[PDB]
């Protein structure tokens, strides 16, 4: 227990850090943030009259809900989990209800905006590196965490040496750099057969240039299992030569 909570009380549940390998302290060469931040002007469209919203009089579980229509359909179930019909291989954009909607703060189309649910833990792996794992089981289709970091422009990313903490959002494109500013996600390692899938979501605003990145369980995750996701082509076409993937997956396409 080298740290009770790396979020310093910002998440709904603490995220302790333990080291059972070497004697290295908890990471501290970065600033933890639970929400995306910017280090410059960023003209995100927060015009409330530009938001598309719903006028549901129920708990938004009907076929009429405008917000679900935008998402093709609401994909959350009564518990807040993704429906089996959800395409993990090619996720759709999810538009959750927002403050312009007529519904209540507890309608069914609100999951990612409710914050952390699963008890996670940061820990030192054998590789002398760091990783994240669940201290409880996570049913499939559950929202685990968001990839939070510093929001930056395309070119801005091009002039950064350390680029291992970037996440492309995909006109002009933007990125999230978790190197200097980030949440528990910056510590999640790559894996070829990932139990976490990133989903572009929209909540308080609907500026398509800035989707927020939500990670969902692509299958059951057992207490103690290590979270992971597919970093992607761009990553490996750059780091593939500095080293080969040590994910240990029978289907590894990078080692
Ligand atoms: C490490 O993996 C990634 C590298 C990226 C990168 N790297 C560049 C390489 C060249 N140096 C060059 C340089 C460095 C220093 C000084 C001058 C020039 C600058 C950083 N650039 C951009 N977007 C940049 C815009 C490209 N644009 C032309 C479209 N996105 C990236 C997304 C990555 O992971 C994605 C998966 C997530 C992994 C999460 N852990
Ligand atoms: Zn609705
Ligand atoms: Zn709603
Ligand atoms: Zn709505
Ligand atoms: Zn691999």
Swiss-Prot record:
Tissue expression from the record: Widely expressed.
Record: residues binding Zn(2+) 2: 54, 67, 97, 101
Domain SET, first and last residues per copy: 118-232
Binding site for Zn(2+) 3: 60, 97, 103, 107
Compartments where located: Nucleus; Chromosome
Modification sites for Phosphoserine: 40
Domain Pre-SET: 52-115
Region (Interaction with histone H3): 154-170, 231-234
Outcome (variant: residue 165 to F): In a breast cancer sample; somatic mutation
Residues given in the record as Zn(2+) 4 binding sites: 192, 245, 247, 252
The protein's assembly and partners: Heterodimer; heterodimerizes with EHMT2. Interacts with WIZ and EHMT2. Part of the E2F6.com-1 complex in G0 phase composed of E2F6, MGA, MAX, TFDP1, CBX3, BAT8, EHMT1, RING1, RNF2, MBLR, L3MBTL2 and YAF2. Interacts (via ANK repeats) with RELA (when monomethylated at 'Lys-310'). Interacts with MPHOSPH8. Interacts with CDYL. Interacts with REST only in the presence of CDYL. Part of a complex containing at least CDYL, REST, WIZ, SETB1, EHMT1 and EHMT2. Interacts with BAZ2B.
Membership in a protein family: Belongs to the class V-like SAM-binding methyltransferase superfamily.
Protein name per its UniProtKB record: Histone-lysine N-methyltransferase EHMT1
Organism encoding this protein: Homo sapiens
């Amino acid at each position: 227990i080298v740290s009770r909570d790396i979020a310093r009380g910002y998440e709904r549940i603490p995220i302790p850090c333990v080291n059972a390998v070497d004697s290295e302290p908890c990471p501290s060469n970065y600033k933890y943030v639970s929400q995306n931040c910017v280090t410059s002007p960023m003209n995100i469209d927060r015009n409330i009259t530009h938001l598309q919203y719903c006028v549901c009089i129920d708990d938004c579980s009907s076929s009429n809900c405008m917000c679900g229509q935008l998402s093709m359909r609401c994909w959350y179930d009564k518990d807040g989990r993704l429906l089996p019909e959800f395409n993990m291989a090619e996720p759709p954009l999810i538009f959750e209800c927002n403050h312009a909607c007529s519904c209540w703060r507890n309608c069914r189309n609100r999951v990612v905006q409710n914050g952390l649910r699963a008890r996670l833990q940061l820990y030192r792996t054998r590789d002398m590196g760091w990783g994240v794992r669940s201290l409880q089981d996570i049913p499939p289709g559950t929202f685990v965490c968001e990839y939070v970091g510093e929001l930056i422009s395309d070119s801005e990313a091009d002039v950064r040496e350390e680029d291992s903490y970037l996440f492309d959002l995909d006109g002009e494109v933007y990125c999230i750099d978790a190197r200097f500013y980030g949440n528990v996600s910056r510590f999640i390692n790559h894996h070829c057969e990932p139990n976490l899938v990133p989903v572009r979501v929209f909540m308080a605003h609907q500026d398509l240039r800035f989707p927020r990145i939500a990670f969902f369980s692509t299958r059951l995750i057992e207490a103690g299992e290590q979270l992971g996701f597919d970093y992607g082509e761009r990553f490996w076409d750059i780091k593939g030569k500095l080293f080969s993937c040590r994910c240990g997956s029978p289907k590894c396409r990078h080692s």
